[PDB]
Amino acid sequence: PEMVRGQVFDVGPRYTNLSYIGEGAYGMVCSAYDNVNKVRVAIKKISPFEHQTYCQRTLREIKILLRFRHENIIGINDIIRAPTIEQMKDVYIVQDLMETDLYKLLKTQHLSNDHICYFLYQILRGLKYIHSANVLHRDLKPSNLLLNTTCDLKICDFGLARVADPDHDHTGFLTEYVATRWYRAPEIMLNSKGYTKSIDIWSVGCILAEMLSNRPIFPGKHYLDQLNHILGILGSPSQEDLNCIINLKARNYLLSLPHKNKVPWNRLFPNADSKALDLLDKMLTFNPHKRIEVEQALAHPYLEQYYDPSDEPIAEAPFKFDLDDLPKEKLKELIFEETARFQPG
Ligand SMILES: COc1cccc([C@@H](C)NC(=O)CN2Cc3ccc(-c4nc(NC5CCOCC5)ncc4Cl)cc3C2=O)c1
């Protein structure tokens, strides 16, 4: 058994010569030499079985990523675990190893307009596929966009993903939410559970803005401050957009705020391509019904050099699970079944 940073990595014989990459709440990640394909790969060790929420994230990730097949979506190559449920305490998920991510790149590198254009195209091309499967990613952000040394981009981390459910989207004002604060659409804080495709478009809009300036556009410091930052740039919502918020707590909160004018994009982003700012505006629309969709975004003049719907594939079938009430002991069973194809035979 190889060890890395006070942690067993029971991934052999196939995977050797481990180097530490990182760690987080999810577990730990290393690169390893794959002795079948003769490449280094990313391997993340997940130890989720003592927490139902970690089992949920693990199962969503595995189920979604094994179904999906797309150039701009990270795949799963292999899954290593014990041969029995009883002996299974860890799951190792093997994925293509990528050089860096967009969070890291934005902290250190100015992006040319051509880089911004290519990254955005790739994000939207991947998202077209995700949305075509009736799936919402729900946590799109720079650290979930992986990059290789030739700037090929792959969306990762589907642990918060869901099947779209627009007819159950409505909730009350200030309802708690899990996905990353800075990339949350304004409606999350007002009347949405984040069960529509428009939640992901907002996040992409925020990423686009962050590409233009290397700084998050709406860096809120707590739940309602996120709405403060959004309205600080978009300005007060129109009467029409307010009328779509039927919940009185949410509407009356908005009506209580002093009138704020829209900050023009070309003042926040003086060096940006005007077509990029036009698409930005459409992605960062307050009213989610008026927000541009993924396929429209791809057809936008900013992306004309890349746009090709015949080369922007969709999923063969809409995705459906066979649940959020299930005990961590049942989710372990499902993780066991779902990983079985990677065992000898
Ligand atoms: C939050 O609670 C949980 C509980 C249980 C399970 C999970 C599950 C669903 N969550 C993840 O698994 C999220 N994670 C972590 C993670 C780590 C590295 C990678 C990666 N990284 C590089 N390269 C690195 C090299 C240096 O610069 C940055 C990129 N290549 C390829 C890959 Cl798959 C991808 C990921 C990824 O999706 C979460």
Tell me how far the alpha carbon of residue 157 lies from the centroid of ligand 1, in angstroms.
6
Count Cβ atoms below 10 Å from residue 252 Cβ, excluding itself.
Answer: 11
259 residue type, one letter = H
Closest ligand 1 atom to Cα of 99: 25
CA distances from 339 to 157, 222, 321, 345 (A): 17, 38, 16, 12
Same domain, 294 and 318: yes
- Contact indicator for 124, 303 with CB cutoff of 8 Å: yes
Domain that holds residue 287: 98-326
- Contact indicator for 18, 26 with CB cutoff of 8 Å: no
- Strand 135-136 and strand 162-163: pairing? antiparallel
Same domain, 75 and 107: no
**13: buried, middle or exposed (CB in 10 Å: 19+, 13-18, 0-12)?**
exposed
Tell me how far the alpha carbon of residue 294 lies from the centroid of ligand 1, in angstroms.
25
Two tokens at 157? 């981390």
- Contact indicator for 229, 220 with CB cutoff of 8 Å: yes
Is 179 a pocket residue for ligand 1 (Cβ < 6 Å)?
no
Contacts by residues 53-56 (CB-CB < 8 Å, ≥ 24 positions apart) = 54/26, 55/328, 55/331, 55/332, 55/335, 56/159, 56/324, 56/331
Is 78 a pocket residue for ligand 1 (Cβ < 6 Å)?
no
Is 95 a pocket residue for ligand 1 (Cβ < 6 Å)?
yes
| Nearest protein CA to atom 13 of ligand 1, as residue | 157
Instruction: Tell me how many domains the chain contains.
Output: 2
- Resolution attained, angstroms: 1.8
Two tokens at 188? 């999350």
Closest ligand 1 atom to Cα of 144: 37
Closest ligand 1 atom to Cα of 157: 37
Nearest to 103 by CA among 150, 144, 72: 144
Same domain, 300 and 335: no
As a whole number of angstroms, the distance between CA 242 and CA 253 comes to 11
- Contact indicator for 9, 18 with CB cutoff of 8 Å: yes
Which phi-psi region, left, alpha or beta, contains residue 130 (left: φ > 0; alpha: ψ -120 to 50)? Answer: alpha
| Nearest protein CA to atom 1 of ligand 1, as residue | 26
Centroid of chain to Cα 303: 21
HEC secondary structure over the chain = CEECCCCEECCCCCEEEEEEEEEECCEEEEEEEECCCCEEEEEEEECCCCCHHHHHHHHHHHHHHHHCCCCCECCCCEEECCCCCCCCCCEEEEEECCCEEHHHHHHHCCCCHHHHHHHHHHHHHHHHHHHHCCEECCCCCHHHEEECCCCCEEECCCCCCEECCHHHCECCCCCCCCCCHHHCCHHHHHCECCCCCHHHHHHHHHHHHHHHHCCCCCCCCCHHHHHHHHHHHHCCCCHHHHHCCCCHHHHHHHHHCCCCCCCCHHHHCCCCCHHHHHHHHHHCCCCCCCCCCHHHHHCCHHHCCCCCHHHCCCCCCCCCCCCCCCCHHHHHHHHHHHHHHHCCC
- CATH number of the domain encompassing residue 67: 3.30.200.20
As a whole number of angstroms, the distance between CA 145 and CA 128 comes to 15
CA dihedral 77, 115, 141, 42 (to 10 degrees): 20
- Contact indicator for 44, 92 with CB cutoff of 8 Å: yes
Nearest to 158 by CA among 181, 133, 176, 182: 133
Same domain, 223 and 274: yes
Tell me how far the alpha carbon of residue 160 lies from the centroid of ligand 1, in angstroms.
13
> Method of determination?
X-ray
Same domain, 70 and 177: no
Same domain, 91 and 178: no
Same domain, 320 and 336: no
As a whole number of angstroms, the distance between CA 94 and CA 281 comes to 38
Same domain, 182 and 287: yes
Tell me how far the alpha carbon of residue 20 lies from the centroid of ligand 1, in angstroms.
13
Same domain, 234 and 122: yes
Candidate from 23, 157, 339 with most ligand 1 atoms within 8 A of CB, to mutate: 157
Same domain, 244 and 275: yes
Same domain, 193 and 103: yes
Same domain, 190 and 262: yes
- CATH number of the domain encompassing residue 243: 1.10.510.10
Two tokens at 126? 């991947």
Cis peptide before 13 (omega within 30 of 0): yes
